[PDB]
Amino acid sequence: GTILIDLSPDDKEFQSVEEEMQSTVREHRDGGHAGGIFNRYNILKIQKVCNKKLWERYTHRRKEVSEENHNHANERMLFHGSPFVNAIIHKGFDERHAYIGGMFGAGIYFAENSSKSNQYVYGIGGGTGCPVHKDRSCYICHRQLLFCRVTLGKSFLQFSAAHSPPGHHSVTGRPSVNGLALAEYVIYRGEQAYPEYLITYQIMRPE
Numbered sequence: 745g746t747i748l749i750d751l752s753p754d755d756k757e758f759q760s761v762e763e764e765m766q767s768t769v770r771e772h773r774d775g776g777h778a779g780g781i782f783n784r785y786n787i788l789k790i791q792k793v794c795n796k797k798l799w800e801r802y803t804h805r806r807k808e809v810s811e812e813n814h815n816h817a818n819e820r821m822l823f824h825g826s827p828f829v830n831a832i833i834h835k836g837f838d839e840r841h842a843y844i845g846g847m848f849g850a851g852i853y854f855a856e857n858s859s860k861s862n863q864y865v866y867g868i869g870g871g872t873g874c875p876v877h878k879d880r881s882c883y884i885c886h887r888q889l890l891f892c893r894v895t896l897g898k899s900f901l902q903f904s905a906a907h908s909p910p911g912h913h914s915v916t917g918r919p920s921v922n923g924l925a926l927a928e929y930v931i932y933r934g935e936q937a938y939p940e941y942l943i944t945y946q947i948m949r950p951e
């Protein structure tokens with residue numbers, strides 16, 4: 745069921761998505777070890793992801809969350825990086841693949857910082873880098889991120905240095921040390937996210 749529609753760079757949606765991508769880059773505490781060294785991206789393509797089945801599954805779960813939370817879905821647009829981006833656009837997010845814990849347990853993780861999600865494109869901690877050059881800071885190979893619509897509902901606030909918590913629909917990882925970091929979020933149901941844009945890009949070598 746999935747089709748990908750290419751957005752023209754003149755399209756206002758292309759521009760607003762690119763801007764969210766570029767404006768949410770930050771420096772990382774690993775000095776670029778996992779995701780490479782860059783201050784900005786070269787955006788090659790932005791595709792709208794269209795799948796009726798996945799979308800209806802999302803909206804159904806969204807209405808359920810909403811009715812449990814005074815008609816407030818608490819919906820965000822957030823980044824997701826993964827080696828399995830092709831499976832996600834075709835089959836949706838699936839929480840059964842969330843074995844190993846990150847900071848907030850076995851769940852599906854999303855980031856406000858595009859550069860944080862970029863650290864996971866080639867695997868946990870960047871894995872071994874691009875498949876062609878084995879370089880976590882490769883400037884040649886094309887990368888992809890998803891920009892996703894995520895239902896947070898009532899989110900458990902975790903100050904920060906499986907199931908949702910009882911009475912909650914998600915977890916929010918609030919940074920409590922690094923003053924420039926944006927939040928990360930965790931959901932425990934795959935139907936609480938819809939992978940709306942597929943962005944293909946390169947990281948750019950600083951001048």
Ligand SMILES: Nc1ncnc2c1ncn2[C@@H]1O[C@H](C(=O)N2CCN(CC(=O)Nc3cccc4c3CNC4=O)CC2)[C@@H](O)[C@H]1O
Binds near residue numbers: 855
């Ligand atoms: N349909 C599917 N087929 C194959 N893999 C699928 C899938 N749906 C989700 N996944 C994948 O399962 C994986 C998963 O849940 N995991 C593995 C990693 N882990 C740590 C984590 O996600 N940290 C983390 C923290 C902050 C941002 C980002 C990430 C990952 N991507 C980001 O943008 C939490 C549990 C994940 O890598 C996801 O992409």
Ligand SMILES: [Zn+2]
Binds near residue numbers: 874875879883885
């Ligand atoms: Zn490469």
